[PDB]
Amino acid sequence: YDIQAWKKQCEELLNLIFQCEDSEPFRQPVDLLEYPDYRDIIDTPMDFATVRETLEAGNYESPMELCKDVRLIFSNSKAYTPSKRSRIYSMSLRLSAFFEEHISSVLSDYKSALRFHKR
């Protein structure tokens, strides 16, 4: 029933994601010299350094907000990919599966703790 536990749990999950080779394309923003049309396709860029920095600045109120930004990293990859078999998109799918598998208990525990708090 710890309402604040999600933050350290998210920090540790972000640490695991940064150790994963599949996250390399998603750690920093996309360079426009390499992908000139990126902002024509993607209106809201997002990356794992921005998520980690937002978390560490105390700018997420809940793990649901963090989850929305992480999911935006993956939807941006799906929207930008020219093919469903591309290397970078295929890395996003594995990383998304890993993230969803680990974030599930973080979300469940937070929502349960909040319900207990408001009982």
CB of 68 to ligand K2M, least distance (A): 18
Residue number with CB closer to ligand K2M (5 or 72) = 72
Contact by Cβ (8 Å): 69, 51: yes
1: contact with ligand K2M by CB under 6 A = no
- Characterize 31-44 residue by residue with b for buried, 16 or more Cβ atoms within 10 angstroms of its Cβ, and e for exposed: eeeeeeeeeeebee
Residue number with CB closer to ligand K2M (8 or 39) = 39
Long-range contacts formed by 49-52: CB under 8 A, 24+ apart: 51/14, 52/11, 52/14, 52/18
Residue ranges in 86-105 that form contacts with ligand K2M under rule CB under 6 A: 86, 88-89, 92
Q: Where on the chain is the footprint of ligand K2M (CB under 6 A)? A: 25-26, 30-31, 34-35, 77, 80-81, 86, 88-89, 92
